[PDB]
Amino acid sequence: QGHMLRLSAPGQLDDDLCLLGDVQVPVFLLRLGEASWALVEGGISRDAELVWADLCRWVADPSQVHYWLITHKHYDHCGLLPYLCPRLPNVQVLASERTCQAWKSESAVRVVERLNRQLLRAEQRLPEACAWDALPVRAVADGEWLELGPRHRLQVIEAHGHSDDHVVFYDVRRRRLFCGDALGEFDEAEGVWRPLVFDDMEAYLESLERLQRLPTLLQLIPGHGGLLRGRLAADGAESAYTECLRLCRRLLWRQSMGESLDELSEELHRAWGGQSVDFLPGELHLGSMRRMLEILSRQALPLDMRNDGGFLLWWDGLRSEMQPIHDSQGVFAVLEKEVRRLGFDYYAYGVRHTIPFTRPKTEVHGTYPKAWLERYQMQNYGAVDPAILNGLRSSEMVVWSDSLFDQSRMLWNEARDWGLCVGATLPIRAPNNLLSVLSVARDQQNISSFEREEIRLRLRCMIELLTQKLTDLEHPMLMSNPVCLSHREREILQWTADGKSSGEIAIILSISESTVNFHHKNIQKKFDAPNKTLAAAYAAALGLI
Amino acid sequence: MLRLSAPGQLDDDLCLLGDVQVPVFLLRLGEASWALVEGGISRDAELVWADLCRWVADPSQVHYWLITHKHYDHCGLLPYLCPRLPNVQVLASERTCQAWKSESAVRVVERLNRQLLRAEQRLPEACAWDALPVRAVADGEWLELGPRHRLQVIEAHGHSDDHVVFYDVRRRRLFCGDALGEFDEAEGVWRPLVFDDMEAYLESLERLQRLPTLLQLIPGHGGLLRGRLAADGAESAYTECLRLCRRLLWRQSMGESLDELSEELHRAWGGQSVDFLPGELHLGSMRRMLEILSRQALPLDGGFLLWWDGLRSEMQPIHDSQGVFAVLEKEVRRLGFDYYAYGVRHTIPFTRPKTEVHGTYPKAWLERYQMQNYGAVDPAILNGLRSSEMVVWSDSLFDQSRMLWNEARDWGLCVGATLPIRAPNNLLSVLSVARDQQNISSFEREEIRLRLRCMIELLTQKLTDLEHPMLMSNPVCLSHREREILQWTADGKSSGEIAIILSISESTVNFHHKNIQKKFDAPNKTLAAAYAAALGLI
Ligand SMILES: O=C(CCCOc1cccc(Br)c1)N[C@H]1CCSC1=O
Ligand SMILES: O=C(CCCOc1cccc(Br)c1)N[C@H]1CCSC1=O
Ligand SMILES: [Fe+3]
Ligand SMILES: [Fe+3]
Ligand SMILES: [Fe+3]
Ligand SMILES: [Fe+3]
């Protein structure tokens, strides 16, 4: 440990972690147990004999290395594999499907080897290498839990943007993130991030957005520059997002004055290239500056779908995404997409009708575990569910909390058993006396106050738009009871619900009492009602009069 | 172009006078009424004056002069051009007016302004600093400058302990002085200018992010910004200030002195302000800002959301309804409208449903409205019975009730909108906003719609929490037994079936029916059931 904020020296960094080789292109070593080890980041080819040396100072046996984690495919994060895997018999390489496929293409591996060979020292000779498609690889998927060791459980997270394959690794026990290049190149002289967007900007920014939601970080480890800790590593993701949008503002401003991509590429190179001269030929750095300046000019918002440039932008984008939809399932799909973008796992949408007064129908549709739907409806938990009933009394969102469920212990216990441990519920009353409710749920993160206030707005807008579209599509869940009254029957009922008898209506409307009672009979027939009272009460409850 | 930076007209009501580096802004309030903004530097006195005589036929028509803060580069012209504007009121923050009474502050200003003359110019006649025709303004004060110029004052301490900014709500135009910083003409980003307090600087930028989306942003240096640059101005300035904070903290964690980064910043920034700032004061101000930042920066080991947080914080502590309505007025005028209304439509009597209203239209039109019971057949209110979408006022909407629309137009209520919401007790509450001369432009429409939705939600919540009478409904209370009996009767059950299900006698049940009727002043069971359903009681 130290009082420093950046640890950037070969050797030990934490009670389970070591930096091997050159701090510029480090390889990280994890002690999963007494005789079990793992590696992280693949570094560059030319360090093969350096890295090896350092490794043998900590590990008594290379056969005890069982796993090697690789963020992405670029030549500077997989160059050591072909040379050191022939020495690590028990190792599995772990990479994203795209990465494992990239190692099978002759073209990509040829690029990798050309760039890695450009990096040898004076009269350097390379030790024997094995085929790229001969590596002992096992592909991983987004969200997969890697049970490396008893105290090393790491989650895979897709972080496309930097490249079309990039992934990062979250050690949740120590709140430690291996982020590779997805945040960029850390400026060692200023303390800010240098964006590295080399495939897609929307995906880059959406990835940084999804990463801002992780628990507060204590340790942040990019592919270059060592390990960051404290505040520097806690607000890392937000800081990378900020610096990317700052470069966007710079580029767009310069282009509004008439500058070319190459011009700002040369300007940026002048002030940045100096850091990566040891492992990156200057011309590839300039070309990457030009490439990223290409993408930014393509996808950045000018200065005049759902995304990044302010809230109103997300609002209009959501609306525009929902206009062409003529199929309800797609409506629900878009809603799900935005719910996940908020940071939750499941959601639900419920409608509470006002009748029958003894047992008011409460219909539900969502994406909770189907078995929970079976149990919920089977035991009709939906009658006195606090999340829905709060809407009868308040227009505020209700964040799920033990105190709120004091009256309904069984429901809360069973929902907790199904993973629905954290969530929130917003209510809104449609203009037809209906109680519509929108709930969101996740597994392990409690709603922080700030995110609570954020949610309230985003969910309000989503549910407000959703009910509108479902009314335009006449969904069966909302259709309640399709009853249309004629103008005459409606005003007859308007009088009757005010207490008038057949005779008084006959007088007032200037028609006969027989006509009025026949109208009453028709009205009854529509409501499937046995008398006038049920018709009047349901019509009042349904807003028809 | 995206940045307008040339002397002369900038908009149909605005002109830039003098040097774009230290500009002075001119507003045409009317045919023979004008106003100024920014006090510039002394040495431009004869330049600016020239340009002024190109636009104003008579110098007596200049009636107001607005001053952001006391720095020498925003008040230097006053002693020299106020002697030429007989009818002008200077408008400034109290601290500024006090600074003008202290001999020391005026001496600093005078020395720094003298440093900037050319070896040729002679000084034109000048008046004393404590003799100026000054009028103090207050944070939030409404300045009814002109028929189409209603500007609000906003306190923006931080850059200096007195800084204030001015917001034209009609044009969504903000004069911000230096509270956001010095706009980088070569890069398009903000350079922080923190010369008094960092917390106040950042809180000022926060309060400014809460304004409606900006179309025109006018700092003390560099001209007028439009488009995206003006929308996220406050957000970007906030961000760049925190970026400088982290740069400083990192360098200090490596063992650098402030002098090092101060000289760096001078080398890379001072060139912009060489014409109006002696280089050594630029280095010293960089050092001052880096000192303040090093003092207050946190050690180590989106505008809409801000508006929302601010409104809530403003409306929770209030426990008296009149103040609630007052806050509503504040935000409505801040958006750019003149009057508002809040209405409640009860569901009964079904033939003559009570429609109560509270707002700020001319009392005579309310007399007229109720006199002709316009609340029954007002289309803006009736749209809420079938839709939760906002309604922009339009002839098609009012084709059905032409008389009401014609008379409302006669009173100036020519442009407006109305939002509907359903309180949790089956009441239809609606919120309207209105002005006279400007049509609702497309982008501001959706921004408005959203803000109105939020405001009315919180309003109905708070007034229910305050137990207002207009929301109060017919006071009838039932117990579980009689309530459940009514739940059964409203489901179509007869007296006998109810008695069977509840395990009591039928005489008991019909006597219960009488109980229920007595409260509603109802003649039979049907009226009771319908009113109970309409009131949400069963
Ligand atoms: O969100 C709601 C109201 C609607 C429930 O929607 C559901 C319930 C089960 C299956 C499905 Br699909 C949707 N209630 C919360 C309370 C805590 S658990 C829960 O469902
Ligand atoms: O805003 C409403 C509803 C009426 C509420 O306004 C009023 C009416 C009387 C006194 C007061 Br205060 C406010 N209607 C619109 C329709 C077009 S003009 C108009 O006022
Ligand atoms: Fe990379
Ligand atoms: Fe890299
Ligand atoms: Fe200033
Ligand atoms: Fe200034």
Residue numbers in the entry:
A (entry chain A): -2 to 301, 332 to 572
B (entry chain B): 1 to 301, 336 to 572
Copied sentences from the primary study:
The majority of traits controlled by rhl transcription factor RhlR depend on PqsE, a dispensable thioesterase in Pseudomonas Quinolone Signal (PQS) biosynthesis that interferes with RhlR through an enigmatic mechanism likely involving direct interaction of both proteins. Here we show that PqsE and RhlR form a 2:2 protein complex that, together with RhlR agonist N-butanoyl-L-homoserine lactone (C4-HSL), solubilizes RhlR and thereby renders the otherwise insoluble transcription factor active. PqsE is a thioesterase that triggers transcription of the RhlR regulon through a hitherto cryptic mechanism, which we identify here as involving a significant chaperone-like component that enhances the stability of RhlR via protein complex formation. In common with many other gram-negative bacteria, two QS circuits use N-acyl-L-homoserine lactones (HSLs) as autoinducers, namely N-(3-oxododecanoyl)-L-HSL (3-oxo-C12-HSL) and N-butanoyl-L-HSL (C4-HSL), which are produced by autoinducer synthases LasI and RhlI and activate the LuxR-type transcription factors LasR and RhlR, respectively.
